[PDB]
Structure formats: structure tokens, C-alpha cells
Amino acid sequence: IPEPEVKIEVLQKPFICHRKTKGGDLMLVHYEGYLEKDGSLFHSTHKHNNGQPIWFTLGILEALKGWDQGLKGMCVGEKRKLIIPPALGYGKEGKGKIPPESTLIFNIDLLEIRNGPRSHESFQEMDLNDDWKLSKDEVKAYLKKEFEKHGAVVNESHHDALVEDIFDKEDEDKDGFISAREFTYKHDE
Amino acid sequence: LIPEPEVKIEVLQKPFICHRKTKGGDLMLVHYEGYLEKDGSLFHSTHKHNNGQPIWFTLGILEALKGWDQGLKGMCVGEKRKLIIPPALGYGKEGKGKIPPESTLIFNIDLLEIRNGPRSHESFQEMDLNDDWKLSKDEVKAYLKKEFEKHGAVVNESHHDALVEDIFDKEDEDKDGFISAREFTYKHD
Ligand SMILES: [Ca+2]
Numbered sequence: 001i002p003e004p005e006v007k008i009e010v011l012q013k014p015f016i017c018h019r020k021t022k023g024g025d026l027m028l029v030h031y032e033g034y035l036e037k038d039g040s041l042f043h044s045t046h047k048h049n050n051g052q053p054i055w056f057t058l059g060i061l062e063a064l065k066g067w068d069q070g071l072k073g074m075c076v077g078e079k080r081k082l083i084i085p086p087a088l089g090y091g092k093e094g095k096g097k098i099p100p101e102s103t104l105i106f107n108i109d110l111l112e113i114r115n116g117p118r119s120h121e122s123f124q125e126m127d128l129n130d131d132w133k134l135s136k137d138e139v140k141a142y143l144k145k146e147f148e149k150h151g152a153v154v155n156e157s158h159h160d161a162l163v164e165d166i167f168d169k170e171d172e173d174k175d176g177f178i179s180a181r182e183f184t185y186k187h188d189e
Numbered sequence: 190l191i192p193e194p195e196v197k198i199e200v201l202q203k204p205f206i207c208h209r210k211t212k213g214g215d216l217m218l219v220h221y222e223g224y225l226e227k228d229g230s231l232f233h234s235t236h237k238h239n240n241g242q243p244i245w246f247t248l249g250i251l252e253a254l255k256g257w258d259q260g261l262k263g264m265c266v267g268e269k270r271k272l273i274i275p276p277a278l279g280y281g282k283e284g285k286g287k288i289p290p291e292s293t294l295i296f297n298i299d300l301l302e303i304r305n306g307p308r309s310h311e312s313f314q315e316m317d318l319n320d321d322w323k324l325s326k327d328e329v330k331a332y333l334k335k336e337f338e339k340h341g342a343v344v345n346e347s348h349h350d351a352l353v354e355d356i357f358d359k360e361d362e363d364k365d366g367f368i369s370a371r372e373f374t375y376k377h378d
Pocket residue numbers: 127128129130131132133134135138
């Protein structure tokens with residue numbers, strides 16, 4: 001358990017949490033940001049953004065390093081305070097209303113989480129022979145290592161059965177493979 | 190509001206058979222040589238330092254240079270890449286040590302092995318939806334569901350229920366139906 005550099009305080013949790021944020025997730029948030037020095041408000045989505053919340057992508061340094069460290073494992077309806085030292089904020093030089101070497105205090109409300117499935121990167125990871133289609137063996141191999149990564153035991157019969165059902169559903173033209181197009185475009189109809 | 194610079198990747202060698210591709214979180218064992226693009230000078234070689242030990246690098250957590258995270262995804266054991274990394278993705282405007290400011294870097298990197306990353310506190314918290322410091326079967330099922338979906342697989346509940354039992358068979362020891370933080374710590378694999 002590594003030393004946290006941002007102070008995180010959970011102010012409120014939902015009655016029930018169905019999903020927690022992780023790297024790559026888009027987070028719809030309202031927030032207020034204050035300078036710890038004088039308590040002055042530097043930004044509020046409510047006041048400075050026509051009252052609209054904003055989308056933030058977690059875990060890719062889209063914004064402050066402190067947001068990346070402070071907003072993991074968060075649920076819709078959850079509210080968090082972050083106290084962020086300058087090194088994880090705007091550091092020396094600062095920005096806008098934020099002076100150099102400012103510790104920042106955020107009040108952040110999570111309204112929705114989204115993640116877009118089936119990126120090209122995931123396909124390429126699975127396509128071990130780079131032929132732009134996925135074989136049953138390629139899918140089985142991926143499932144095996146993904147389980148084993150987490151130290152989760154692989155029951156081969158359960159996995160073979162899972163693979164068979166995946167292909168029954170996704171292999172639309174029944175050539176035995178899931179092509180790039182069959183991977184990318186999905187319809188239940 | 191922001192833009193971005195990119196690494197240039199040139200593949201130098203590919204293995205006849207690729208058994209697994211690198212993905213965020215993996216441990217990569219690599220040899221590398223690093224050069225300044227400016228004058229072509231060698232600043233480091235793993236073949237020369239510490240009696241030729243290759244080095245371990247965790248992909249996708251900014252353990253090292255930004256350009257390494259951008260350039261080493263989807264890589265196979267036996268694959269070699271040349272990364273050309275602009276300063277913003279290397280040691281930046283400041284530079285560091287023997288790397289002068291605003292240095293474009295050239296790395297030739299060979300992948301010797303991929304190993305599973307360790308169980309993290311972060312992963313446990315992400316799964317532990319109700320913050321009771323143990324993972325219910327439903328929480329593990331939820332995690333499986335979202336990860337399956339991310340990779341293009343939406344399958345029948347019977348599959349998830351079966352996979353969860355495989356997992357709990359090993360990880361739930363007192364058989365209270367949960368995987369406590371204690372139980373999660375070591376893959377007893
Ligand atoms: Ca393939």
C-alpha cells in the first residue's frame with residue numbers, strides 16, 4: 001500500500017454502489033475548486049460553466065495528476081474532497097487564478113460513469129497472429145492469461161464452453177473466426 | 190482544451206510465433222539501449238550496466254517515461270522496437286542528469302518476457318463496491334461482467350456464475366462466501 005500524496009476524503013456515498021471508477025473511465029462531475037491559502041473559489045462548474053457538469057477521463061493525465069490519484073474507485077452519487085499539493089496540481093508557475101505553489105482543495109460530485117468497449121487496442125492484443133480476425137484459440141488464450149493474471153484458476157471446460165458461446169453469438173458469417181468487423185460492430189437484433 | 194505529441198514506433202523484429210501481447214499492468218522484462226537523437230550518442234545500455242541484467246518495467250502506470258507507455262503496448266516476447274521519443278514524452282524541457290534539456294530520445298527495446306502484475310490494493314477497492322473490505326460473489330461477478338463487456342463479450346449469467354465459483358473455490362478459505370482483504374493479498378497460486 002503506497003503512500004498517498006493527495007488527501008482524499010469521501011464525503012458521501014450512494015445507498016448502493018453498482019460500479020466504481022477505474023483507469024479509462026469517463027466521469028461526469030460537478031466540482032468546486034478552492035485555494036487552500038485564502039479559501040478563495042477559483043472555479044465552480046455550477047457558477048462558471050452555465051451550471052453544467054463536465055466530462056473528465058480518469059487515469060490518462062487528462063487533467064491534474066491529483067485528480068488521477070484521487071478519483072479512483074468512486075461511485076455515482078459519491079462526493080469527495082481532494083486536498084492536492086502543488087506538485088500534483090499546477091506546481092510552480094501555477095495557472096489562471098491559481099498562483100505558483102498552491103495547494104488546491106476540490107469538492108467533487110460524481111454523476112455518471114461511462115466506458116467505451118472494444119477499442120482497437122483490445123482487438124490487437126487478442127489477435128496473436130495479426131491476421132485481423134480472432135480464432136477460438138486466440139480467444140481461449142486471452143481468457144486464460146487474463147484469469148491467471150489475477151491469480152484466478154482456469155477451469156478449462158468452463159472456458160471452452162464460454163468460448164463456444166461467444167463465437168455462436170459473435171461469429172456472424174460462421175467461418176469460425178471473429179473478424180475485425182464482427183468484433184467492432186455489434187447488434188443483438 | 191489540450192493537444193498531444195506522439196512517439197514514433199519502428200518495429201525492428203517480430204517473433205515467428207506471438208504467444209501473448211503486452212497490456213497495461215504487465216511486467217515486461219526488456220533489454221534496451223538509449224541514444225540521444227541529436228548526436229546519436231549512447232546514454233545507456235542494459236547489456237553494459239549491472240553485468241548485463243535485463244530490466245523489469247511495468248507497462249501503463251507511468252513507472253518510467255511517458256513515451257515508453259505509449260510505445261510498448263501490444264508487444265510480443267521476441268519483438269524488438271525502436272522508439273523515437275520527443276522531449277515532452279521523455280525527460281522534458283528540464284532534462285535530467287546526463288540527458289540535456291529538450292532531448293529527443295531513441296530507444297531500441299527487446300522484450301524477453303511478460304509476467305503478471307501483482308495483486309493491487311487499488312484493484313481490491315475497485316471490486317469492493319460496498320466498502321466492507323471483502324468481495325462478495327456478486328461483486329466479483331460485476332467485475333467480470335464489465336471486463337468481459339470491455340473486450341466485446343456479453344454472455345449468459347450461467348457463465349459468470351460458474352467462473353465466480355471457480356475463483357472462490359481457491360480464494361474463499363473460511364467459506365463465508367466472501368474474499369476478505371486478507372484472502373485477496375496473496376494469489377495462493
Ligand atoms: Ca488472428
